[PDB]
Paper text:
NExo is an enzyme from Neisseria meningitidis that is specialized in the removal of the 3′-phosphate and other 3′-lesions, which are potential blocks for DNA repair. NExo is a highly active DNA 3′-phosphatase, and although it is from the class II AP family it lacks AP endonuclease activity. NExo folds into two planes of beta sheets sandwiched between two planes of alpha helices. Notably, the amino acids residues of the active site of the NExo 3′-phosphatase are identical to the active sites of NApe, E. coli Exo III and human APEX1.
In addition, a catalytic point mutant (D146N) was used to obtain the structures of both the substrate and product DNA complexes in the presence of Mg2+, the essential metal ion cofactor. The NExo mutation D146N is analogous to the D210N mutation which inactivates human APEX1 (37–39), and our biochemical analysis demonstrates that D146N completely abolishes activity in NExo. The position of divalent metal ion cofactors was determined for the inactive D146N in complex with substrate DNA and Mg2+, and for the product DNA complex with Mn2+. In the D146N structure with the 3′-phosphate substrate, we see that the scissile phosphoester bond that links the 3′-oxygen (O1P) to the phosphate is bound within the active site of NExo, and is oriented towards the mutated catalytic residue D146N. Recognition of the 3′-phosphate is mediated via hydrogen bonds between the 3′-phosphate and neighbouring residues N148, H247, N7 and Y105. The substrate bound structure of NExo has a Mg2+ ion coordinated between the well-conserved D146, N7, N9 and E34, which are positioned on the leaving group side of the scissile phosphate bond. Therefore, the Mg2+ ion is well positioned to stabilize the increased negative charge of the pentavalent transition state and the displacement of negative charge onto the 3′-oxygen during the dissociative phase of the reaction. That the D146N mutation completely abolishes activity of the enzyme indicates a critical role for this residue in catalysis. Catalytic residue D146 is positioned for an in-line attack of the phosphate centre for direct coordination and deprotonation of the attacking water.
Numbering used by the authors: 0 to 256
The structure:
DNA sequence: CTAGCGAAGCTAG
C-alpha cells in the first residue's frame, strides 16, 4: 500500500503549520510540495525531521521551489532537467522512494499566450517530456506529479468559453499535456473519477473558492504498473477551506498491491 | 487577492 499527496503550498514559510498538520493527520507515505518560495538554506529541515520525515528539496529565493518529504529515504535524487541545464529556476526534483520513482514538478505558469513566459513554458515542457521518457526507460513504477498549470479539458475549467484559448486552457498547452500522456502515463484522477469537476486551484480574487469556480491543474500521472494498482484520488478542499490558505488544494492518490 | 522584497509599488501567480 502507498499514499502520496502533492501540494502547491505557495510559500512554505507561511503554510508550514498546515504542512505539519497534513503530515500528522492521515499522513501520506510521500508528500511533494511546489512553490516553496524559500532559498535552499532556508528550508525547515529540523521541524520536519523532528516529526520523522526525510526531506530532499531544491529552492531559490522568492520563487519556485520543489520538495519531496517521505517516511523512507529518497534515493538517487536528481535536480532539474538535463535537456535544460542552464535554467536557474528550481522546478523539478526526482527521487526513488520505496521502489517508486517520484518526479515532482512545479511547471511553468506561462502568464499569457503572448508572454515570453509562454515560450519558456513550451521549451520547458519539451525538456520535461524528454526527461520523463528517459526516466520511464528505467523505472516500472513511476509517478510524475505536481502543478502542471494546464487544465486538460473543458471539464477542468469552471468556464470553457471565457477561458477559450487562454493560459492554462489553450489547445497548445493541452497538446503538451497530451505529449506527457503519450509516454505511457495515466491521469489517475480521471481514471478513478471520469466525470465531474475536481478543481484544484481557485483564484484568491473574487471569492472563487467560495463560488467553487476553479481549474484542475494539479495532477498525479502514473505509469501502467502504477495505474494497475491505482485505487483512489481525492482533492483536499478542506485544506483549501482553511484560514490564510494556499490557492491550490492538495491532491492525494492511493495505491496498493 | 496573496506573497516576496522591503519599505512602495512592481513581479509573480
Ligand atoms: Mg500560488
Ligand atoms: Mg473550448
Amino acid at each position: 500500500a502507498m499514499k502520496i499527496t502533492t501540494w502547491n503550498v505557495n510559500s512554505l514559510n507561511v503554510r508550514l503549520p498546515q504542512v505539519q498538520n497534513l503530515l500528522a493527520d492521515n499522513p501520506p507515505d510521500i508528500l511533494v510540495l511546489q512553490e516553496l518560495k524559500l532559498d535552499q538554506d532556508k528550508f525547515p529541515a529540523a521541524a520536519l525531521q523532528m516529526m520523522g520525515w526525510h526531506c530532499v528539496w531544491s529552492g531559490q529565493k522568492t520563487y519556485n521551489g520543489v520538495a519531496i518529504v517521505s517516511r523512507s529515504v529518497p534515493q538517487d535524487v536528481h535536480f532539474g532537467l538535463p535537456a535544460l541545464p542552464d535554467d536557474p529556476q528550481r522546478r523539478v526534483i526526482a527521487a526513488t522512494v520505496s521502489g517508486v520513482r517520484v518526479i515532482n514538478v512545479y511547471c511553468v505558469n506561462g502568464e499569457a499566450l503572448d508572454s515570453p513566459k509562454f515560450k519558456y513554458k513550451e521549451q520547458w515542457f519539451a525538456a520535461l517530456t524528454e526527461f520523463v521518457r528517459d526516466e520511464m526507460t528505467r523505472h516500472g513504477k513511476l509517478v510524475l506529479l505536481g502543478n502542471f498549470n494546464i487544465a486538460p479539458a473543458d471539464a477542468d475549467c469552471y468556464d470553457p468559453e471565457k477561458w477559450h484559448e487562454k493560459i492554462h486552457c489553450s489547445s497548445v498547452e493541452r497538446q503538451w499535456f497530451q505529449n506527457l500522456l503519450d509516454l505511457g502515463l495515466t491521469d489517475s484522477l480521471r481514471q478513478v473519477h471520469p466525470e465531474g469537476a475536481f478543481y484544484t486551484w481557485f483564484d484568491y480574487r473574487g471569492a472563487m473558492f467560495q463560488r467553487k469556480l476553479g481549474l484542475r491543474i494539479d495532477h498525479i500521472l502514473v505509469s501502467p504498473a502504477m495505474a494497475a494498482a491505482l485505487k483512489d484520488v481525492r482533492v483536499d478542499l478542506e485544506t483549501r477551506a482553511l484560514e490564510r490558505p494556499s490557492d491550490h488544494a492538495p491532491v492525494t492518490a492511493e495505491f496498493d498491491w
